[PDB]
Every structure is written in structure tokens, then in C-alpha cells.
Amino acid sequence: HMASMKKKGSVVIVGRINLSGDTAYAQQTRGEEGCQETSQTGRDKNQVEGEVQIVSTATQTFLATSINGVLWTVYHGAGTRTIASPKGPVTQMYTNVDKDLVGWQAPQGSRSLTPCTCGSSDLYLVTRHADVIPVRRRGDSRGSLLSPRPISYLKGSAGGPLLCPAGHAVGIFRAAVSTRGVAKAVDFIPVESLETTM
Amino acid sequence: TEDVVCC
Ligand SMILES: [Zn+2]
């Protein structure tokens, strides 16, 4: 019974959302078979680039965002999992189920978003398809969608950033306020909460 | 009924 008992896989970086051009676009960097292998070994020799990663477990694909040298994502996606890296699986540096937040040391080669300092309530949610969706900040951790969307559209984008007009980080997207499967607002983890965790 | 749905 115990020999049959295996550990859960690592989170695996399988792509990125490229935001450093004049265009936003998703890039896949690992296909399904590579992802499965890498989840088991915890050894990812790909060179990571950029700020927003697309990540997968065996059951979910979602996003992760580097801010202040830490790659952050949602606990409801990653749980307590290690992340695959060049030298093997990396244990989380931060874990907080109550905030729905986890983080690992940012991968070598990655870059971090700068926390927002401009005070803007005009926000932009970056999805896993590299859609840039306007969100009006309404409070510490909430913003309204200018256009309603099905919740299914936003599924898989938790862990991604809310950006201010200058492209600086305001928070990490985690959940949508929905009625009858239609999202009208988003819930996010503010960057100030990440700094408190650190 | 509004609810917060994890994404
Ligand atoms: Zn700003």
C-alpha cells in the first residue's frame, strides 16, 4: 500500500504571456507529454522568460506572476506543490490558504513586474489567452468588469496580473463575482498583501 | 445570488 503511494506532481511552467511588445500574446513552451514528464521529475531545463507564466498541474492550468522577485500564484491552483526548476523541484517560499496565495523564488531568467505607484483605478486584467480586459477598481480587492463575461472565459486565468495603465502590478487575479455564470466583477490579491506576506 | 467563483 505504501510502495504504491506517490507524491503529487510539481507545478510546471508550460508557457508565458508576452507583454513586452506592442502586442500581448500567449506562447506555449511545453506540450502535454513534456509537461507530464516534468511534473514527475520536477526538473525543468527550459529557460524561463518574462513576468507572467502559464503553469499546469495534472488537473488545472492557470497563471503565475513575478513581483518583487517571487513568482506568485493562487493556492486554489497550486496547493502546496513544488515548482519544477533546472535543479529539481523548488519548495514554496510563501503559502497562505486564507489569502489564496503562494509563491516560489522567481525562476532564473524571469523578470518581475514593478508594483504600481500611480494610484490609478483604471486596471487591466491579463488572461491566459493574452486578452487585456478593462477593470474599474472599486475597493482594496475588487474591481468591476466594464463588459460582462461568462465565468468560463476567466477560468484558467487566476494567478495573472491586474495592471495599471502604465503596466505596473496592482494585484493578482483570483476569482470572479458571478451571477448565473456571468461574471460582473473580479476579486484580486492586492500587491500590498504580497508585500505583507514577504 | 452573487458568489465569488475561483478562477
Ligand atoms: Zn500604476
What domains lie within chain A, and their CATH numbers?
A: 1-113 (2.40.10.120), 114-198 (2.40.10.10)
Please say whether the dihedral angle defined by the alpha carbons of residues A118, A160, A40 and A98, taken in this order, is positive or negative.
positive
- CA–CA distance, A135 with A198 (Å, rounded to integer): 26
State the distance between the two ends of chain A, measured CA to CA, in whole angstroms. Answer: 40
- CA–CA distance, A74 with A159 (Å, rounded to integer): 5
How many whole angstroms from A66 Cα to the centroid of ligand 1?
16
Q: For residue B2, what is the nearest residue in chain A, using CA coordinates?
A: A179
- Tell me, in Å, the resolution of the deposited structure: 1.6
Indicate the residue of A154, A157, A177 with minimum beta-carbon distance to B2: A177
- CA–CA distance, A196 with A67 (Å, rounded to integer): 13
